[PDB]
Each structure stands twice: as C-alpha cells, then as structure tokens.
C-alpha cells in the first residue's frame, strides 16, 4: 500500500530553508516528477521545485488560515506533508497546463 511511499518520511523531500539556487542544484539530471519543498524567498511562504519535461519548475506554497496550497480554492492542507501526499496522486495540471506531473519522487528517496 501507499503507506510504503517515501513521501511519508518528510526528510526525503523537505530541504528546509534552501534557496532557489540550491533547489535547482539538487534536481539537476533527475527524472521528471522528482521534487522537493523548501522555504520561499518570499518570507513566510514555502516553494515546491519539481522537474517537468526535463526542467525545474518553482511554485509558491501559500500559508493561509485554511491551510497550505498553491492557489485558491486549494489552500486546504494542514501541513506540507499533507500537501505533498495529496499531490503524489494529483497532477499539478489542475493548476497549470504546463505542470502535468505528480510529486512522484522525493529528491532524497
């Protein structure tokens, strides 16, 4: 079952306060759907960096009263790990036609 997924160990994908440049270093040469989460330069927000079509894409993660998320009406998740578990089985295409991947492979899995 999905309890086996590496996503359940937050250390496989949460790279703390790493900046954009460090995120890009980490994902170089990785297969599509490899991802990480980190703090954003936008203080108090987070970011997801994910490989799509061989390129690293960066998405801000909002922190709102109803939860974390990428956009309304999806700012719903009580933690980063709930967000990550959701998008392990939800393509980001519902947010942007150019992000048609799941959060498939934690960078340190």
């Amino acid at each position: 079952g999905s309890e086996d997924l590496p996503h359940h160990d937050e250390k496989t994908w949460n790279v703390g306060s790493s900046n954009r440049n460090k995120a890009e270093n980490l994902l170089r040469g990785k297969r599509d759907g490899t991802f990480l989460v980190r703090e954003s330069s936008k203080q108090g927000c987070y970011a997801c960096s994910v490989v799509v079509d061989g390129e690293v894409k960066h998405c801000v993660i909002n922190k709102t009263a109803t939860g974390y998320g990428f956009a309304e009406p999806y700012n719903l998740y009580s933690s980063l790990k709930e967000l990550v578990l959701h998008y392990q089985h939800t393509s980001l295409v519902q947010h942007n036609d150019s992000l048609n991947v799941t959060l498939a492979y934690p960078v340190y899995a």
């Binding site: 960066h58 801000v60 309304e72 947010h95 942007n96 992000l99």
Partner: peptide, 6 residues
C-alpha cells in the same frame, strides 16, 4: 518568478 497556479 514562480509558476502561475490559478
């Protein structure tokens, strides 16, 4: 610069 997610 971040992806537009709306």
């Amino acid at each position: 610069d971040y992806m537009n997610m709306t």
